[PDB]
Amino acid sequence: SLPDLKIEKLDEGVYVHTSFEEVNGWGVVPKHGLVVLVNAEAYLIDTPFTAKDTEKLVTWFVERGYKIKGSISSHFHSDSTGGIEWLNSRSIPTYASELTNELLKKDGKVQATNSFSGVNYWLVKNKIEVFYPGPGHTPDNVVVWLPERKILFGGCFIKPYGLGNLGDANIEAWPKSAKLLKSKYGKAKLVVPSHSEVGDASLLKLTLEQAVKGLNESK
Ligand SMILES: CCOC(=O)[C@]1(CS)N[C@H](C(=O)O)C(C)(C)S1
Ligand SMILES: [Zn+2]
Numbered sequence: 172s173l174p175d176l177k178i179e180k181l182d183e184g185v186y187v188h189t190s191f192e193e194v195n196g197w198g199v200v201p202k203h204g205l206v207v208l209v210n211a212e213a214y215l216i217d218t219p220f221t222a223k224d225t226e227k228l229v230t231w232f233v234e235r236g237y238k239i240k241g242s243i244s245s246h247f248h249s250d251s252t253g254g255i256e257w258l259n260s261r262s263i264p265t266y267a268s269e270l271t272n273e274l275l276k277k278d279g280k281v282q283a284t285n286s287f288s289g290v291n292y293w294l295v296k297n298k299i300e301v302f303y304p305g306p307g308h309t310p311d312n313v314v315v316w317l318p319e320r321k322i323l324f325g326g327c328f329i330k331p332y333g334l335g336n337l338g339d340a341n342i343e344a345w346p347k348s349a350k351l352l353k354s355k356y357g358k359a360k361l362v363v364p365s366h367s368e369v370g371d372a373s374l375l376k377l378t379l380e381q382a383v384k385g386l387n388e389s390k
C-alpha cells in the first residue's frame with residue numbers, strides 16, 4: 172500500500188499535491204505538483220501519477236467550490252501526464268508543449284488537448300507563466316512561474332541532490348539550461364521540485380551544480 176494523495180497549502184492560492192507510485196528500481200517515489208487558484212478557478216500544475224489520484228485531487232477542489240479550468244504538464248513522463256486521459260474524458264482542458272505532445276504521441280500515450288509552442292507561454296495572463304529553459308531532465312521539460320507569489324514549479328528539472336534517471340536526459344545541455352533558469356528566476360521566493368522538498372532560489376544553484384557535476388562524471 173502506497174501513501175495517499177496529500178494536498179497541502181503552500182501560499183495564498185497555491186497548494187502542493189503529492190502523489191506516490193512504486194517505480195521499479197526506485198521504490199516508492201513521491202511526486203509534487205501544484206494546484207493554483209485564480210478567482211474561483213483552479214489550474215493543475217502537473218497531474219498526479221494516476222487517474223485515481225487526479226480524480227481525487229479534482230474532487231477535493233470542486234467540493235470546495237473551485238472550477239477546474241485546466242491542467243498543464245511540465246514534461247511527458249507519466250508522473251506529470253498520468254491524469255491527462257482522465258481529465259480529457261471529463262472535458263477539462265489539458266495543456267502541454269508541442270514537443271511534450273509529440274513525445275506522448277511517440278510513446279503511444281494520450282496527448283493534451285491544447286498545445287503551445289515557444290520559449291514563454293501565458294497559461295493565465297499575468298498569473299501563470301510557462302518557460303522552457305532548454306533540454307535537461309528530458310528534451311521537453313518546462314517550468315511554471317507564478318509572478319504574483321514569486322513561486323517557481325521546477326518539476327523534474329530541479330535536482331538539488333542528484334540528477335536521477337538519465338534515460339531521457341540531455342546531460343550535455345542541462346548545465347546551460349540550468350544556468351538560464353537560474354538567471355531568469357534567481358529571485359524566486361520558493362522553488363518547488365517534483366521529487367524533493369520545497370526550498371528557496373538556492374535549489375536553482377544546487378541544480379546547476381548537480382548538472383555540471385553530472386556532465387563531468389560522464390568522462
Ligand atoms: C513512470 C515512473 O517513472 C516516472 O514517472 C519518473 C518520471 S521523472 N522516472 C524517474 C526515474 O526513473 O528516475 C523517477 C524519479 C523515478 S519518477
Ligand atoms: Zn521525468
Ligand SMILES: [Zn+2]
Pocket residue numbers: 248250327365366
Ligand atoms: Zn519526475
